[PDB]
């Protein structure tokens, strides 16, 4: 139980840090089915969202502007950036509250912290998925 | 074989990207370049392909008082015939002699193809309208009352708490386990299993209509209630007729539409009917560019099929040849277009040029379907109101367990 | 007489997983992340408050439920039974959705029709209809004015590339 | 009326847009206009009458006078109740009715 | 409203009303064509239809 | 003897709702095909009219 919250920590940890949350591959077509080379291919993230492709310049921006689609998204993922920020937030303290028990309720009000992370970021993945479907 | 002060356009007369390899009359061609052709059988006169540098089609510009591009090419003797797209209105009467008119047209509106909506949260619901839903729950009450009431007062598991889970466990047909014993007990469980299968299978069913045959709304139609129900950018043309129209509003449903181009920001105007598709095309939103008619039906025909044309023609305009007020060639100019209108030789123009490219709308609109899988944003509000649901559930756990903690 | 050459219609193989195309992958992952999520909460939400419900047989609780089979238990308190309600309304929506469009796959694909005269492929400009060249046929159209055929030779001649092949062994590898 | 929506009436706008108007609101203007043209005052071919009432309805038009005419015997006349402003939802949910 | 017919019959109708010299001026919901051109005069159109 | 009375019963029961949830998802997108005339060209094919 230990092991399972500071597992927790770093998993989520790593990906809400990192920048590899979202693909892009926006190309065209020719006939003969002569489909495309790469032609708009955009990495993503949370907080720094690097192009790839259509310029090759890694903008990894903190995003309040440019630098069509693109920021769009970033508009869109404003809209569900807090629930991983949320579920960061209740796992360290179910993290601190759980090694405190360890040294009553303290063990169990932990436990608290933990499905109540779950349950924000399920709708963390919903409303980051219903934010891309819609764009 | 004067001057045709035609201007570079849609159908009417454009520069073909042939006459980089070829001359002659092949450099500006269309439409109108072939009128050219079939009213040069009566006058006897020729060409003289001249698109106007100046081309801001136009009328005396505002103070200056000078003619704006055709008519500054038209009326100042730099021009005779003005075989083009040119549309008479009263003060260019005022300064030219005119012809019949070829066709007529109309303000129309470019709305963009309606692509289809974004759901809601609670488009889930959307199969079942939201007066059954507010009649489904005070049905569930209404019926979970009965089961109480007569499971009470006659000879009991059933209490109220036990007679709403029964109740919700026939709607979600997740079934039961308390199943009620008495006669009178079986008959609202009999009847309430009943209102559940119907329900059910009409929930499922329009489901299934609707995600087979979308029919779609464009809600700008009608342009009355484009002007009333003020919802969009009313962008339009620039200098030249069609605002000039609406500058001269005295009915009121288009003055308080002119009203709101008069109070309109940034594009009031901008320029360029091939721009001012563009500013549909792009944006998406909001623009909703007032052209002329008969350029619309062409720029929602020629093969992006992504425009639309909503609503039918706010004024009608014709489009007759300009003569600068007098000017001889006139006489054989009219009869020439009305042996070509009688004898319907421009209607035959009309039934070429309108039929050349490839055909779109509903035609391209045939058996071309490949439906798409659901989408998380569709069923996206069951996932709130189920996790939801949950935070509900785990707030309850800490107010009955502090209500047997402060019971000690 | 002229006749048309398409394509054959073979089907397909439809890859075996292809029951779950009405519902896409980030739904089949939502659910099983909104099936634990709720296991879970039933699980506590009926533990320190007053047994027979341990993770395993909440687990079998909401697997049970949401297969809209009858699973035996039941939840017992209004802090339980709002666990069982909303995953029970979140069940009914799910496969709802799923038996609308796999209900939606099939007579969409029911009403696509082979294309079967010539006055049909008229209308389908989806298909390009090419001809021979330098041969009786595109004499035919060029010529006759049965006035179907005069629509066909109006977008056989605007053609993008040339639809005119130019021999019948380049033709057939064509199409 | 009585055909029962088996008989189409190809009539022109400005009279088709008063018919809807009228109590028994059970009529509706398809489409767009399939063509255009224009009502005119009449006289005799080679008349003494042409010119001033040509010069009239040109006085008319700016004066703002016809246009008027336009509204003064048409905007009233919604008295039907325009069922068709309270309409364009067009839904298609199950009602209650179903 | 008005018409043209086998020979002429000359104009049946309202512009009938107008043609053989029966009336003068015709203010009325009279359409403008072309056919109607020819025969008698009319004014600038005042409505759209 | 007994089991065999509850199954074909539920058999029987499978097999009626799933024809009335069938005709009930037929009766709806039938006419929600059904399309009015909206212009001229659409009552030029439709000879019904
Ligand atoms: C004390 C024991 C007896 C009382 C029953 C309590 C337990 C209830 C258990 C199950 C019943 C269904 C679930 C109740 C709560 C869930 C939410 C709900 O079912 O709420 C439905 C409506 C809220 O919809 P609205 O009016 O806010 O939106 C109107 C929008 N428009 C204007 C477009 C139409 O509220 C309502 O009727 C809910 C009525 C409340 C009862
Ligand atoms: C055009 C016309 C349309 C109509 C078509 C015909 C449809 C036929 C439907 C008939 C249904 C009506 C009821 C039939 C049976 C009567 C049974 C009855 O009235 O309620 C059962 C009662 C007492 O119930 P309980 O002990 O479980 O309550 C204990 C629960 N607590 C613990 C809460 C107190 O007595 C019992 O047990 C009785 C159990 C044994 C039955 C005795 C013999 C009955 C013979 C024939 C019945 C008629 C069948 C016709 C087919
Ligand atoms: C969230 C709350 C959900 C339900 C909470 C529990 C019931 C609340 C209630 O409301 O229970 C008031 C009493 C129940 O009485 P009981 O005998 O079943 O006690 C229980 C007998 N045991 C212990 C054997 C089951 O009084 C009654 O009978 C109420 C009788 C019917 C009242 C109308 C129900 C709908 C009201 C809607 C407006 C809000
Ligand atoms: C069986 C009967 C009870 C439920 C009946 C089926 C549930 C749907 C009824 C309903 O209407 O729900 C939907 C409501 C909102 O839909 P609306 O049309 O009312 O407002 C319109 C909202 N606009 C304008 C923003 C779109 O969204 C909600 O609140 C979702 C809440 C409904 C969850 C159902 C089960 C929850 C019950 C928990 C306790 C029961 C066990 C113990 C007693
Ligand atoms: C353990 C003890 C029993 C526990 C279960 C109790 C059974 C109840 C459970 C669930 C309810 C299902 C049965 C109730 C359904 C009502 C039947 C009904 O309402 O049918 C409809 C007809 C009216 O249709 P229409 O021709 O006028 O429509 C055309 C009219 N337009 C043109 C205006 C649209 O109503 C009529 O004629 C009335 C004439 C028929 C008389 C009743 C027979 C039907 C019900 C049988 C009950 C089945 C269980 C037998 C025990
Ligand atoms: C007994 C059954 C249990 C609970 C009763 C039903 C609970 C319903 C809660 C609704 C929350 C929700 O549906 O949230 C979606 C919100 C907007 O919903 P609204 O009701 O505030 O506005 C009206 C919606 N209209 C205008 C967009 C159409 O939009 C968003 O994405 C904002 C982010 C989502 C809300 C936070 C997640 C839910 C709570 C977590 C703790
Ligand atoms: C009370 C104690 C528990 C009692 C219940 C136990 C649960 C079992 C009950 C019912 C069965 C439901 C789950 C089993 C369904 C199999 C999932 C599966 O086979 O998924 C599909 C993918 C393979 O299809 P594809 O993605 O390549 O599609 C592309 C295919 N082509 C090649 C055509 C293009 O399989 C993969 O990738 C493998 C990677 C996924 C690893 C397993 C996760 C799925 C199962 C979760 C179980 C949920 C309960 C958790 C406890
Ligand atoms: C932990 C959770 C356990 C399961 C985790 C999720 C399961 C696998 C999901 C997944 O990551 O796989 C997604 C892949 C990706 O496909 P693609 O993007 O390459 O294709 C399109 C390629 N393009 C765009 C080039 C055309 O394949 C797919 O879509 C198909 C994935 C579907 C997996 C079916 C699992 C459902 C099992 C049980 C149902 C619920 C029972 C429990 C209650
Ligand atoms: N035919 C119009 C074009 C410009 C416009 O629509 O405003 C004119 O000459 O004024
Ligand atoms: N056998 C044919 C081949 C060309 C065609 O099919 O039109 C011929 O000689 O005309």
Same mark, same amino acid.
């Given at each position: !139980?230990?092991?399972?919250?500071?597992?927790?920590?770093?998993?989520?940890?790593?990906?809400?840090?990192?920048?590899?949350?979202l693909?892009?591959?926006?190309?065209?077509?020719?006939?003969?089915?002569?489909?495309?080379?790469?032609?708009?291919?955009?990495?993503?993230?949370?907080?720094?969202?690097?192009?790839?492709?259509?310029?090759?310049?890694?903008?990894? *921006?903190?995003?309040?502007?440019?630098?069509?689609?693109?920021?769009?998204?970033?508009?869109?993922?404003?809209?569900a950036?807090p629930?991983?920020?949320?579920?960061?937030?209740?796992?360290?303290?179910?993290?601190?509250?759980?090694?405190?028990?360890?040294?009553?309720?303290?063990?169990?009000?932990?436990?608290?912290?933990?499905?109540?992370?779950?349950?924000?970021?399920?709708?963390?993945?919903?409303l980051?998925?219903?934010?891309?479907?819609?764009? | 074989?004067?001057?045709?002060?035609?201007?570079l356009?849609?159908?009417?007369?454009?520069?073909?990207?042939?006459?980089?390899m070829?001359?002659?009359?092949?450099?500006?061609?269309?439409?109108?370049?072939?009128?050219?052709?079939?009213?040069?059988?009566?006058?006897?006169?020729?060409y003289?392909?001249?698109?106007?540098?100046?081309?801001?089609?136009?009328?005396?510009?505002?103070?200056?008082?000078?003619?704006?591009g055709?008519?500054?090419?038209?009326?100042?003797?730099?021009?005779?015939?003005?075989?083009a797209?040119?549309?008479?209105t009263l003060?260019?009467?005022?300064?030219?002699?005119?012809?019949?008119?070829?066709?007529?047209?109309?303000?129309?509106?470019?709305?963009?193809?309606?692509?289809?909506?974004?759901?809601?949260?609670?488009?889930?619901?959307?199969?079942?309208?939201?007066?059954?839903?507010?009649?489904?729950?005070?049905?569930?009450?209404?019926?979970?009352?009965?089961?109480?009431?007569?499971?009470?007062?006659?000879? =009991?598991?059933?209490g109220?708490?036990?007679?709403?889970?029964?109740?919700?466990?026939?709607?979600?047909?997740?079934?039961?386990?308390?199943?009620?014993?008495?006669?009178?007990?079986?008959?609202?469980?009999?009847?309430?299993?009943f209102?559940?299968?119907?329900?059910?299978?009409?929930?499922?069913?329009?489901?299934?209509?609707?995600?087979?045959?979308?029919?779609?709304?464009?809600?700008?139609?009608?342009?009355?209630?484009?002007?009333?129900?003020?919802?969009?950018?009313?962008?339009?043309?620039?200098?030249?007729?069609?605002?000039?129209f *609406?500058?001269? !509003?005295?009915?009121?449903?288009?003055?308080?539409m002119?009203?709101?181009?008069?109070?309109?920001?940034?594009?009031?105007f901008?320029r360029?009917?091939?721009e001012?598709?563009?500013?549909?095309?792009?944006?998406?939103?909001?623009?909703?560019?007032?052209?002329?008619?008969?350029?619309?039906?062409?720029?929602?025909?020629?093969?992006?099929?992504?425009?639309?044309?909503?609503?039918?023609?706010?004024?009608?305009?014709?489009?007759?040849?300009?003569?600068?007020?007098?000017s001889?060639?006139?006489?054989?100019? =009219?009869?020439?277009?009305?042996?070509?209108?009688?004898?319907?030789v421009?209607?035959?123009?009309?039934?070429?040029?309108?039929?050349?490219?490839?055909?779109?709308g509903?035609?391209?609109?045939?058996?071309k379907?490949?439906?798409?899988?659901?989408?998380?944003?569709?069923?996206?509000?069951?996932?709130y109101?189920?996790?939801?649901?949950?935070?509900?559930?785990?707030?309850?756990?800490l107010?009955? *367990?502090?209500?047997?903690?402060?019971?000690?």
């Amino acid at each position: !139980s230990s092991v399972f919250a500071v597992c927790g920590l770093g998993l989520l940890g790593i990906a809400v840090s990192t920048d590899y949350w979202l693909y892009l591959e926006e190309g065209i077509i020719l006939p003969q089915n002569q489909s495309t080379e790469v032609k708009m291919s955009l990495h993503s993230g949370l907080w720094r969202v690097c192009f790839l492709a259509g310029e090759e310049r890694g903008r990894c *921006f903190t995003i309040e502007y440019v630098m069509e689609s693109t920021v769009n998204v970033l508009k869109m993922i404003r809209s569900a950036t807090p629930f991983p920020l949320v579920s960061l937030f209740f796992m360290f303290i179910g993290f601190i509250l759980s090694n405190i028990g360890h040294i009553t309720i303290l063990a169990f009000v932990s436990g608290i912290f933990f499905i109540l992370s779950g349950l924000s970021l399920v709708v963390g993945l919903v409303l980051y998925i219903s934010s891309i479907n819609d764009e | 074989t004067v001057v045709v002060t035609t201007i570079l356009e849609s159908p009417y007369v454009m520069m073909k990207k042939n006459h980089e390899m070829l001359e002659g009359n092949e450099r500006y061609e269309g439409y109108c370049v072939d009128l050219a052709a079939e009213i040069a059988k009566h006058c006897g006169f020729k060409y003289k392909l001249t698109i106007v540098g100046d081309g801001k089609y136009g009328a005396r510009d505002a103070d200056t008082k000078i003619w704006n591009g055709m008519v500054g090419e038209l009326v100042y003797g730099k021009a005779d015939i003005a075989i083009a797209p040119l549309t008479i209105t009263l003060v260019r009467e005022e300064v030219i002699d005119f012809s019949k008119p070829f066709m007529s047209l109309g303000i129309s509106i470019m709305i963009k193809k309606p692509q289809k909506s974004k759901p809601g949260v609670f488009s889930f619901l959307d199969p079942l309208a939201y007066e059954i839903w507010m009649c489904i729950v005070f049905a569930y009450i209404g019926v979970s009352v009965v089961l109480f009431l007569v499971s009470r007062f006659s000879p =009991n598991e059933f209490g109220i708490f036990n007679s709403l889970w029964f109740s919700l466990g026939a709607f979600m047909q997740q079934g039961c386990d308390i199943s009620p014993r008495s006669l009178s007990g079986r008959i609202v469980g009999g009847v309430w299993w009943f209102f559940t299968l119907i329900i059910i299978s009409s929930y499922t069913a329009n489901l299934a209509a609707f995600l087979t045959v979308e029919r779609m709304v464009s809600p700008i139609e009608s342009a009355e209630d484009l002007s009333k129900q003020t919802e969009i950018a009313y962008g339009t043309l620039d200098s030249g007729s069609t605002k000039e129209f *609406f500058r001269r !509003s005295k009915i009121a449903v288009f003055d308080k539409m002119w009203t709101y181009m008069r109070s309109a920001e940034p594009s009031v105007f901008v320029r360029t009917t091939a721009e001012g598709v563009a500013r549909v095309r792009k944006s998406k939103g909001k623009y909703a560019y007032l052209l002329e008619s008969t350029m619309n039906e062409y720029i929602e025909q020629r093969k992006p099929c992504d425009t639309m044309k909503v609503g039918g023609n706010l004024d009608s305009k014709g489009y007759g040849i300009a003569t600068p007020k007098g000017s001889s060639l006139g006489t054989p100019v =009219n009869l020439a277009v009305l042996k070509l209108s009688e004898q319907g030789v421009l209607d035959k123009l009309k039934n070429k040029w309108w039929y050349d490219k490839g055909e779109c709308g509903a035609k391209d609109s045939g058996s071309k379907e490949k439906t798409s899988a659901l989408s998380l944003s569709n069923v996206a509000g069951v996932f709130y109101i189920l996790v939801g649901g949950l935070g509900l559930a785990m707030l309850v756990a800490l107010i009955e *367990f502090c209500y047997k903690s402060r019971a000690e």
